[PDB]
Design a protein around this ligand. Structure first.
Ligand code: TVH
Ligand code: TVH
Lengths: 94, 93
């Protein structure tokens, strides 16, 4: 956060639409700190799949020589076994 | 270490197209450890921008109530002051 601590702990009362949204994912109250609002928005965001975590770590290799060699348009940098399998089809163990 | 150390250190010879890919970003040899192949693949990937921060960190809220509350189709989770500004419009302190 580039937001000062004092600001994060500011006590606030969500308007009716923001309140309904927060309670829709389990918020219990009518007043919150700003830190609490952000926690519940985070839950809302993840629940409505407005952010995708897997898609944060993707190589897009279609129409590139790498896509030709691996035989795929995309892959996760976090899935090492899957990369190794694709690499092995392009070499010989000595 | 998803991959065992000994496998990472396995000595391998890239077939011609992979080899040309590797030398295209500075690789100097015909023979490599698997670790070395992954390093040079990484350099290729980043050079050609096949992986790019431009697609990262985004909340796409255009088609959700949140987009209507925030007045935008999307926002970056890293833009903390923007997020605060957008939230303050939706409340009273
Ligand atoms: O770092 C992240 C993060 C990363 C990826 C996806 C999501 Cl969803 C989040 C998000 O919540 C994550 C969770 C915690 O509550 C688990 C749910 C979030 C993003 C955007 C919003 Cl508007 C709210 C939370 N978050 C927390 C946060 C972001 C920004 C600020 N700020 O403005 O100073 C404060 C807190
Ligand atoms: O963690 C990351 C990472 C994160 C974001 C983008 C990129 Cl490009 C990479 C990548 O290279 C990073 C750099 C180092 O050489 C600086 C360039 C990479 C991804 C995919 C491939 Cl196919 C190769 C490297 N990498 C390293 C790595 C990933 C997977 C394995 N594994 O399967 O055992 C081994 C090593």
């Amino acid at each position: 956060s580039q937001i000062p601590a004092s600001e994060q702990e500011t006590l606030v009362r969500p308007k009716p639409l923001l309140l309904k949204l927060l309670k829709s994912v389990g918020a219990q109250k009518d007043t919150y700190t700003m830190a609490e609002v952000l926690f519940y928005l985070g839950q809302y965001i993840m629940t409505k799949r407005l952010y995708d975590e897997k898609q944060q770590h993707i190589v897009y290799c279609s129409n590139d020589l790498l896509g030709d060699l691996f035989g795929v348009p995309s892959f996760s940098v976090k899935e090492h076994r899957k990369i190794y399998t694709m690499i092995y089809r392009n070499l010989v163990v000595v």
